[PDB]
Each structure stands twice: as structure tokens, then as C-alpha cells.
């Protein structure tokens, strides 16, 4: 994705939308890269598992190739620094971005009509929360104990 | 609902008192209670689909009723004569629903112009549904002209008027899934609710 | 049921507007919110399922009328109709009769009388078990001649071990209409009147 | 009146604390947490009434469902007869066998009322389940069998070991009887039987 | 059932293994959790059992579709057949059409067009109420001439004080069989194709 | 009595310094009643499922007298005993899972000799039912008997696996080792789900 600087951001949100000028954006006018311009006379749009975005024009029975939508792969996924919107910008620990066609070079495929759900299991988070809350309780108890120690020491 | 109850669980976790934190012996209780409401929501919607499927089933299986003739609410009775020689005058049977039994039941049959052509006394009719077949003859005993006639049924018990609703016989042509469903399209009369349909002949 | 979610807020809004700053009430959200609100949501949404199932029952009760028209059921009674067909030489046929027995009987006898009341036929059907049994009278009187066309009374006496058992006579009844009473869907037998599904011992 | 058993239990133990001030002012809402408890059962038990009404509708629909057809029921009786038309060919009610094991050597022996075998039918290999065949109504010599009834015995064997065989016979359904247990298929000569015991509905 | 029970069992061992040794949890609530989980597990299998009931009802509906085989139904579509029988003097009859309206409309215009696209006639009877309203067109030109036998399509536009309404066109479609396809058991309409039973609005 | 051994064992470590309140015990019993009611409904719902199965089995009796579309290549041709009867052939079908545009039905007599060639054309994914006119390649009336049909479906020059289908009159409903089965007589015994189409 192109930020207003001319830099690069990267998002796993493919709920793409059409602006007034036809460029493909993602929830914020983020003009995707490389530049992709949906035609005005679009009837239906398709995006294969190799990322070619092609549209149905009126009258013509052919999906003209309007753009190509390749992915970007980093050697360290964890290193990314989020800036909100589920966007991540390149950083020194993430590694240089490798821009490549979907399906190849270790990348994935592009599925139309799907949204990827968050990888958060409620049960795991709740058991984690129980553990953490007990630890929090014990730590506040320790703080209060030191408080009592000091205030008695001064009562001396 | 399930989402809106998680926020009230997320709010407490991120707003619990820092130096006096809440007890930890409710998280699985509350979630199970939250999961109870979510389970009923899945139940509640699925029952509605069952209701729709039952409505569709009632709409179907009614080709026999379409082929047959039924009596529907209304004051209309059709009288006709066959094209064959010596044909007996035919008259659409009617009926009346009585919430309470009545001792004096009067059926006034009038032409389309409103003039009373026939007056009949039925007598005692108990609570329920009663059916009758008009002879197609007016008061003087002559056969009425072929056409539509209006029937007014008055049922009273000991001088106290009771609800008497005359019924109309018509031929069924189709079964309609309208705004609610189960409508009995008959043609000139229109659509009729299957529940309000009286009997099938 | 909907008053729970409205009497809950009135009490709640009271405690929120009447907190003591030195002793603020953190039990407003300790359990009061997630436990009781959902417990209200448990019952308030059980109103709909009861309502939804009631609507489904209302739809289903009309399926009885949606189904076919009865061609003649077997009901309790003693009347048997007999007659001759329009064609010449037709064998006289009678509407079927039957017996309902709570327990099997070691003797079963049938007495058929005309409208005058005099016995016109004595029949030994045989041995029957506990339940509903249906047979058809041949239309022949004691001497074997053709019985007059009309109505006849059938009385079935069945006993086991010399003790008379509860034998319920049953008669054929032709169904002609699908009525809807104040209780539900009912069958109409015409001359016999209206009958209920539960009391129909058999359908022919 | 269960509400008064607890609503007045609350306000007989709260209409005293306010005098003596052991005030919490915050457990007071346990009234609602208990009314929703008593009502939360008041709708489940009454739901059992509606579901029982649905069950009753199910039996009513089963009773309304009526067909005039034939069924395959256990028995050895095979009927044979001729129509009123001249030159009619004798037809016999179909018979059959239910085997819970596959059988390779199956013989159908048909005996008359006199006890002598009139016709022997060689069936052959049979898979697991219910098989229904029709007797041609002809004796071993090929002559037309006399009108009446015959006894069928089906012997089934797999690998030289005779298997238990259930003889079957055709029966015209004559009605549905509402007995002490429910709907029974009153077949007339065969009697009444349940839907499950019918090997095949023809 | 065990899909949630196994997941809810991790919450028991998380609460048992993570209780404050100074202020442990009373076992009074422990049976409440087990009762609450059983409540949750009971509801979960209720949904599973009920879905099977929905599938069985769908299969029974597909089987019942064989009752009206050879007849025709009105399903979402625009294809119209106009023609006459082999008997002389038959008036050109148009297959029944219909409109389904989500909201009642005071001004509904139904224009019929032939294969060539020529407008044959527009109907102005008045308003058409919400639900499914079906009609049998007389098969006549705008000037009273019998329409040529062939294919027709109706465009139905509803207006509510200048504001349009979205409507569902329906056409009579004779069913020649009931075909089990990839999704479910559809009704083969012949020329119109195959359609499921749930979109059937009216039959003839 | 699941939540009763738990309930009786709960009243042992009862801790009189903080015991079961009346509110908790009443709630605990009532919450148990909630579980019991749901399970009672769950067992009840199974009975309704069985009743629905019986109802659909009773509805399936209309299939008797009607023919199903079943996998096979056999088409029966016959002429009525009445004078002037035109020989008629049992309808057949094709089952496909891929879009096809070029479908050929080669119909051969009982001897295997190709008697008819039919070009069906484009077919979508699913079950398609057709009827042989009873005319062989030269247009003469085919003799009554059994015919073997080979259906070849192709799209864009590559052939697709085509499943031929055939008419089979349903003769009865059998209570087999699994449940309701359709005994078709000559074709044999079949189930409900495999039925391509009812005619």
C-alpha cells in the first residue's frame, strides 16, 4: 500500500473498495500498489489465485486484465511495527520486503469472497487472563505489604 | 448479543481496579452464562426457519384442495343451471360458525339487487360449525335465476343475538405464499387464509 | 419477563446517582452487569422460543386440514347400513362393524337386529385379542335370505372365562368434511355428525 | 404465589435492616436475580408442553397419512387364484426371505394344503437383507396350480451351513387401527402389524 | 457436544490451578459452573439435533414435491409461454405471471414484451397489495388482437409516490421431475431449468 | 442423578464459617432443574425426528408407480399391444460435475451394434434427463428390446467423465438393514439419496 509519503505499508485486509477515481483502496483511501484502476463500466470483478484482477465490461464477453496484485513477503513476520488499521511498515528487524506474485516464492493464494478471521481463540485468552489476573492480585498484595511495613516503621 | 456481552467482559478486564483487583472465580461462570445466551440465539433463529419450512409444506400438498372445492368466509352463494336437458339446479353449499348454541337461526338469501328472495329457519344449532345446501329456490318456490346471492345468517338463543358468520363456497385455483403465506387463490374471490378456510369438499 | 430488564435499570441508575465517593460501589460492575443482564437475556429470549414454538404449533394444526379428505373411518357405534346397488343382481352389502376389547375374550357373539328390534342374525365371529377388530356383515339373516335394505343394530357380546368383558361396539362412518372446532381439526361424518381424530379406532 | 415466598422473604429481612443499619444497599438486587431464576424454569417446563403438542400433531399426521397398497410380512402363506375373465393366468402373491447373513444356496419349496410339494423354486445366491420374489403359479411339471393356498419354506445356506430364514408373504393393507399402543397396519387376513415389522411396502 | 465441553473443561483446570492460596474459591459455585456448562452443552446438542430436523423436513418437502408432478408452479422468473391448443377457436392464452411486493404499492405497471422486444400491452388495473399477486393474461395485443404464440417477458414497476419498489417476478413453470443436484433437491421446470422448493410462491 | 452425587458431596466440606446460603442452594437446585428440562427436551426431540422419518417414509410410497433416474446404460424399447402403437423407449439421463459442451449418446442394440447416434450438446453440471425417440440411425423404428447407451461429454476438446442414467420404475419400499430402500424390480434395490430424478 502507498502511504501519503510515497513509502510502503502492508496489510492483510483485502476488503478492497473503489474511490471516486477508480483506484483500489483499503479503508482510508490507501491507494494500493501497484496502481490499479477499476473501470467506470465495471459489471463484475474477479481475482484469481495468482492475483490477476480482471473486470467484465458491458457488451464485451471477456475479462480484460486491468491489474496485477502481487504480495510482499518479509523474512521476519514478527518484526513488523504496526501503526494501526492492521497496517505494518517495514522495519530493520523485519527485513527487506520481497515483492512477488501470489502462489510463488513461498507466498500464499488469494481467495475471493473470503475474509480472514482473527487468530484469537476465546478459550485460550480466557485461561491466560485467569492466570494473569491472579498474578496481578499477588503483585498488588506485595505492594500493599511493603506499604504497611513502611508506615509501621515510621510509626516507630 | 454474544459480541455485546464480550465487550462488558472486556471492559471489566481493562478497567478493573489496579491495587484492589477483582476476584478470578467468575470468568468461566460469566462466559458460560454468555455462551448460554448465544446458544439460545442460534436456537431462536433456527426455529424460524422451521416455521418457514412448515409454511411452505402447508402451501404444498394442497393440490388436492385446489382440485376440490372449499367453503370460505363470505356471504356469496353461486346458483346455476346445467347446459344439459333436465339438469337439476346447482347451488354452492354454505355454512355458519356459532361460538354458542342458538335456538332461532334465520337465513335470509337475497339477490344481487338486495331484494330478499328466500327466508329459511334452521332451528337449534350447537356450538361449532354447521353446513347447509340451499335448494336454489326463492320464497315462492320457483328456481332462482343463475347468479350470485347474498346470505345473512342470524343465530340467537332465547332472544339474545349470537355471532353467526355465513360462509361462501368457491373453487380453488392456487396456493399463494403472500406476505405471510398460505393464501387460497380462487380467482374472482381472491386469496383466502387456510386457517380461515372452513371445510374442503 | 421484559420487566426484568426495566426494573433492573431503575435500581441500577439509583445506585449510580447515589454513590458515596469515599465508598464507591464497584459491585455495580463486579457481577451485577455480566451475570444478571445475561441471566435476564436467558429468560427474555426464552419468551421468543415459546412464542416461536407456539406459532409453529399454530401452523402445524392446519396441516390436518391440508392433508387428504377422509374416505371413511371406523368409529364406535351400533348402526349398520344395508342396501342394494343400482345394477341388477347386486349382492347386498352392509357397512362394516367391529368390537373394541380391553382384554381377549374366549367367546364373541354378534346379534344383528332390524329397525323393528327383532333379532335378524346371530354371528359367531370367533376369537379376538385385546384391541379393535373390524368385520363386515354379509347382509344375510338367520335363514340366509337377503335382509331388507335399511338400518340395523349390531350388539357384540364378548366374554372371557365366563365373565363379560367391556366390549365397545363400533360402526363404519364415511368422512365427508374437515371441520375446525373450538378445540382443533375434526372429521365430519355427515349424518353421524362430527368426530375427533383420537376417538377414531380405525380408518378404512 | 412463589414470588411472595421470596419477595416477602426479602422484604421481611430487609424491612428490619434499614432500622438497624447493617446496610449494604447493594445486595438488594438479589430479588431480580431470583425472579429470573424461577421464571427461567417456568418457560422450560412449559416448553415441554408445546413440544408434546407437536408430538401429538406428529401422530395426527401419521394417522392422516393413508395409502392403499401391499406389504411384505413374515409368513408362509402364498395365495393362488384366477380372475373372473376367461383364460386368466393364475397369479400368486409375492413371497420373500429376510436374511441377516448372505446366502448362496437358497431353495424355495412350495407345498399344497395336502402337504405334498407342488413346486420347488431354486433361488440361488442372496445378499444380506430382504429379498422378495413372485411365484409363477405353476407346479414342477409346469401345469397351472389349483386355486387355493400353499405353504412356502425357504432354506438358505452360506458355504454349506444352513442359515436361519424368515419366510415372507404379501398382504394387502386394509386399514390403520388405533390400538392401545398406536397405529397398527390392519391387513385383514394377516391381522394388524407395526410399520417396522413390514419387510417391504409394495 | 464435546466440542464445547472439552473447551470448557480447560476453564475448570484453569480456575483450579490458578486460585489464590490465601483466598481460595468456595466450592459452592463449583457445582454452578458444572450445572452451567451442562446447560451450555445441552443447548449445543439441541441445535445439532434441530438442524437434522430441518434437513429431514427439507427431504420430506422434496418427497412431497412429487405429489403435484406434471403441474406447474410460479417461481422467480420472467419466461412466459403464449399459445393455444389443437382445438379450433382456442383463444391465445398466456401462462400465468405474478408479482411479489415487499411493501404494498398504489401504482404498479406491468408491461409485457414479445421476443422481438415490442411492447404488446401494459396492464393498469390499479394497486397491487404486498405479497404474491398472480394473474392470467388474456394473450391479447394492445388493440385486442390475439398475441402470436411464443415467448414473452413482463417488466413490473411499482411506485410509492415517486419512490420505486423492488419486486419479484414469478412465472408458471411446469415441473417434469424432481432432481437431486449439488445443493439440494430441485424441481426441473424444463425450459425454465431446475429450482428449489423454497422460492415457490404460488402453484396452479 | 448426575448432579446429585455432586450435590450430596458438596454438603460435606460445608464450612459453617461461610456455608451455602439459601439463595445459592435454591439457585443451585433451580439451575439443576434447567439442565434436567433441556435434556428432557433433547430426548423428546429425537422422538420427533423418528416421527418425521416415519412421515417421510409414508410420503415416499408415492414413488411406487413412478420411475427414478439411476446409474446405468440400459434403455428398454417396447411397442403396445394395440394396433398402430408407436414404439417408445425408457428415458435416460447423464450425471456431470464439470461444464460440458459436446455430448454424444451412442445407442447400440442388444448385439452391441451402433443403432443410433445423438448429439445432445452443451450441459451444465448436474443431472440431465432425456428421452430416446425410438428411431435408429436411418430413422426406422427400432425393435423392442434392451439398448446400451454410451454417453461421452467433452468441453473444449477434452472428454469429461459422464455418468449415464436410466429409467427404473419403483416397485416397492423395503425396510432393509439400514432403513427405507427403493426396490425397483428389474433394476433391484436402491436408496433415496442416489436418486438423480423422479419421473
Automatic annotation (TrEMBL), chain A:
UniProt keyword NADP present: no
Residue ranges of every copy of the Flagellar hook protein FlgE/F/G-like D1 domain listed in the record: 1-55
Subcellular location field: Bacterial flagellum basal body
GO CC annotation terms, alphabetical: bacterial-type flagellum basal body, distal rod
The keyword RNA-binding is assigned to this record: no
Annotated Flagellar basal-body/hook protein C-terminal domain residues: 112-156
Major localisation: other
Keywords tagged on the record: Bacterial flagellum, Cell projection, Cilium, Flagellum
Coiled-coil stretches noted in the UniProt entry, renumbered to this chain: none
Signal peptide (UniProt feature, chain positions): none
An example Gene Ontology biological process: bacterial-type flagellum-dependent swarming motility
Oligomer status and interactors: The basal body constitutes a major portion of the flagellar organelle and consists of four rings (L,P,S, and M) mounted on a central rod. The rod consists of about 26 subunits of FlgG in the distal portion, and FlgB, FlgC and FlgF are thought to build up the proximal portion of the rod with about 6 subunits each.
Family (UniProt): Belongs to the flagella basal body rod proteins family.
Protein name, as recorded: Flagellar basal-body rod protein FlgG
UniProt organism field: Salmonella typhimurium
Residues shown, of full length: 105 to 260 of 260
UniProtKB/TrEMBL annotation, chains C, E:
Alphabetized InterPro entries for the sequence: FlgD, FlgD/Vpr_Ig-like, FLgD_Tudor
Domain FlgD/Vpr Ig-like: 92-162
Taxon lineage: Bacteria, Pseudomonadati, Pseudomonadota, Gammaproteobacteria, Enterobacterales
Entries under Pfam families matching the protein: FlgD, FlgD_ig, FLgD_tudor
Name the UniProt record assigns to this protein: Basal-body rod modification protein FlgD
Job of this protein: Required for flagellar hook formation. May act as a scaffolding protein.
Encoding gene per record: flgD
Entry keyword annotation includes Lipoprotein: no
Annotated FlgD Tudor-like domain residues: 60-201
GO BP: any one term: bacterial-type flagellum organization
Family: Belongs to the FlgD family.
Swiss-Prot/TrEMBL keywords: Bacterial flagellum biogenesis, Cell projection, Cilium, Flagellum
UniProtKB/TrEMBL annotation, chain D:
Gene: flgD
Source lineage: Bacteria, Pseudomonadati, Pseudomonadota, Gammaproteobacteria, Enterobacterales
GO biological process: bacterial-type flagellum organization
Name the UniProt record assigns to this protein: Basal-body rod modification protein FlgD
Biological role: Required for flagellar hook formation. May act as a scaffolding protein.
NCBIfam families: PRK06655.1-1
Family from the record: Belongs to the FlgD family.
Domain FlgD Tudor-like: 58-199
Pfam family, one: FlgD_ig
Keywords linked to the UniProt accession: Bacterial flagellum biogenesis, Cell projection, Cilium, Flagellum
Keyword Phosphoprotein listed: no
FlgD/Vpr Ig-like domain mapped to chain residues: 90-160
